[PDB]
Design a protein around this motif. Structure first.
Motif, PDB file in Angstrom:
ATOM      1  N   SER A  40       0.557  -0.905   0.222  1.00  0.00           N
ATOM      2  CA  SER A  40       0.145  -0.086   0.246  1.00  0.00           C
ATOM      3  C   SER A  40       1.057   1.033  -0.020  1.00  0.00           C
ATOM      4  O   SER A  40       2.143   1.111   0.644  1.00  0.00           O
ATOM      5  N   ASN A  41       0.089   2.820  -0.150  1.00  0.00           N
ATOM      6  CA  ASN A  41       1.335   3.407   0.143  1.00  0.00           C
ATOM      7  C   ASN A  41       0.883   4.627   1.248  1.00  0.00           C
ATOM      8  O   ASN A  41       1.059   5.006   1.110  1.00  0.00           O
ATOM      9  N   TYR A  42       0.634   3.790   2.468  1.00  0.00           N
ATOM     10  CA  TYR A  42       0.471   4.406   3.243  1.00  0.00           C
ATOM     11  C   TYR A  42       1.898   3.736   4.297  1.00  0.00           C
ATOM     12  O   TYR A  42       2.570   3.031   4.504  1.00  0.00           O
ATOM     13  N   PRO A  43       2.152   5.111   5.010  1.00  0.00           N
ATOM     14  CA  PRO A  43       2.959   4.751   5.479  1.00  0.00           C
ATOM     15  C   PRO A  43       3.648   4.284   6.821  1.00  0.00           C
ATOM     16  O   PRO A  43       2.683   4.433   7.541  1.00  0.00           O
ATOM     17  N   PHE A 134       3.637   2.360  -4.400  1.00  0.00           N
ATOM     18  CA  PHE A 134       4.862   2.681  -4.585  1.00  0.00           C
ATOM     19  C   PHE A 134       5.416   1.824  -5.298  1.00  0.00           C
ATOM     20  O   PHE A 134       5.553   0.534  -5.315  1.00  0.00           O
ATOM     21  N   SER A 135       6.012   2.662  -5.866  1.00  0.00           N
ATOM     22  CA  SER A 135       7.315   1.407  -7.410  1.00  0.00           C
ATOM     23  C   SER A 135       8.688   1.723  -7.276  1.00  0.00           C
ATOM     24  O   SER A 135       8.972   2.965  -7.194  1.00  0.00           O
ATOM     25  N   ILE A 136       9.556   1.118  -7.438  1.00  0.00           N
ATOM     26  CA  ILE A 136      10.475   0.922  -7.689  1.00  0.00           C
ATOM     27  C   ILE A 136      11.186  -0.166  -8.668  1.00  0.00           C
ATOM     28  O   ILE A 136      11.110  -1.509  -8.542  1.00  0.00           O
ATOM     29  N   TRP A 137      11.915   0.358  -9.574  1.00  0.00           N
ATOM     30  CA  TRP A 137      12.369  -0.113 -11.043  1.00  0.00           C
ATOM     31  C   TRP A 137      13.372  -1.323 -10.957  1.00  0.00           C
ATOM     32  O   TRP A 137      14.052  -2.151 -11.038  1.00  0.00           O
ATOM     33  N   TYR A 138      14.241  -0.379 -10.429  1.00  0.00           N
ATOM     34  CA  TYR A 138      16.091  -0.560 -10.458  1.00  0.00           C
ATOM     35  C   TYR A 138      16.539   0.529  -9.164  1.00  0.00           C
ATOM     36  O   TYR A 138      16.447   1.389  -9.821  1.00  0.00           O
ATOM     37  N   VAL A 139      17.700  -0.251  -8.993  1.00  0.00           N
ATOM     38  CA  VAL A 139      18.831   0.686  -7.858  1.00  0.00           C
ATOM     39  C   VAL A 139      19.723   0.022  -7.989  1.00  0.00           C
ATOM     40  O   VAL A 139      20.061  -1.306  -7.981  1.00  0.00           O
ATOM     41  N   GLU A 140      20.922   0.853  -8.560  1.00  0.00           N
ATOM     42  CA  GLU A 140      22.284   0.879  -8.478  1.00  0.00           C
ATOM     43  C   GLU A 140      23.370   1.249  -7.520  1.00  0.00           C
ATOM     44  O   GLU A 140      22.294   3.082  -7.115  1.00  0.00           O
TER      45      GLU A 140
END
Length: 156
Positions: A40-43, A134-140
Motif C-alpha cells: 500500500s502507499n500508507y506510511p 509505490f514502485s521502484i524498478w531498479y537501483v544501483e
C-alpha cells in the motif's frame, strides 16, 4: 574512483504480490513486472539494502519502466548508516516520470570527513499519479569500498 557497490535486499515494509523487493536488482525496462511495489502507499514504506562491504556511498541510480508510470516516485528520501537501526538522511528528492535512468549524489561527509554505511534505506513518499502503491524498478549504488579509504573513516 567510484565503483558499483553490490547489495542484497535486507528488510522491507511490505510488497504487493509478485512485485518482490529483489526485482530492483534487475534493469528490465520493457517488463512491467520487474519492480518492487509496496503493498500500500500508507506510511511508512521502505526498502533496506545491505551492502556486501562497508562503503562511502556516493551515488544512487534509479532505473525506469520504458514508459511513464503512475507508480514512479515523485518524492522519496534515502537514509544510510553502519548500523541498520541508526541512520542519517542522505538525500531528499524525486524522480522524473520518464523512461530515463537518473543518478543522484548522496551526502557522504560531515564537515569534509567522509563517513561509511553498510545499510541504505529508500523511503518512497509520493507517487506520480493516482495509485495505491509505490514502485521502484531498479537501483544501483556507487561509491568507495577500498579498505585503504574506508577504514580510516571508521570510528575507533
Amino acid at each position: 574512483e567510484c565503483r558499483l557497490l553490490p547489495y542484497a535486499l535486507h528488510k522491507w515494509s511490505s510488497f504487493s504480490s509478485t512485485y518482490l523487493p529483489e526485482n530492483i536488482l534487475v534493469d528490465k525496462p520493457n517488463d512491467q513486472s520487474s519492480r518492487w511495489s509496496s503493498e500500500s502507499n500508507y506510511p511508512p514504506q521502505y526498502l533496506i539494502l545491505k551492502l556486501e562491504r562497508p562503503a562511502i556511498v556516493q551515488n544512487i541510480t534509479f532505473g525506469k519502466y520504458e514508459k511513464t508510470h503512475v507508480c514512479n516516485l515523485k518524492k522519496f528520501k534515502v537514509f544510510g548508516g553502519m548500523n541498520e537501526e541508526n541512520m542519517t538522511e542522505l538525500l531528499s528528492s524525486g524522480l522524473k516520470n520518464d523512461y530515463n535512468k537518473e543518478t543522484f549524489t548522496l551526502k557522504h561527509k560531515i564537515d569534509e570527513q567522509m563517513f561509511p554505511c553498510r545499510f541504505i534505506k529508500i523511503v518512497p513518499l509520493l507517487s506520480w499519479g493516482p495509485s495505491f502503491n509505490f514502485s521502484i524498478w531498479y537501483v544501483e549504488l556507487s561509491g568507495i569500498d577500498d579498505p585503504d579509504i574506508v577504514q580510516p573513516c571508521l570510528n575507533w
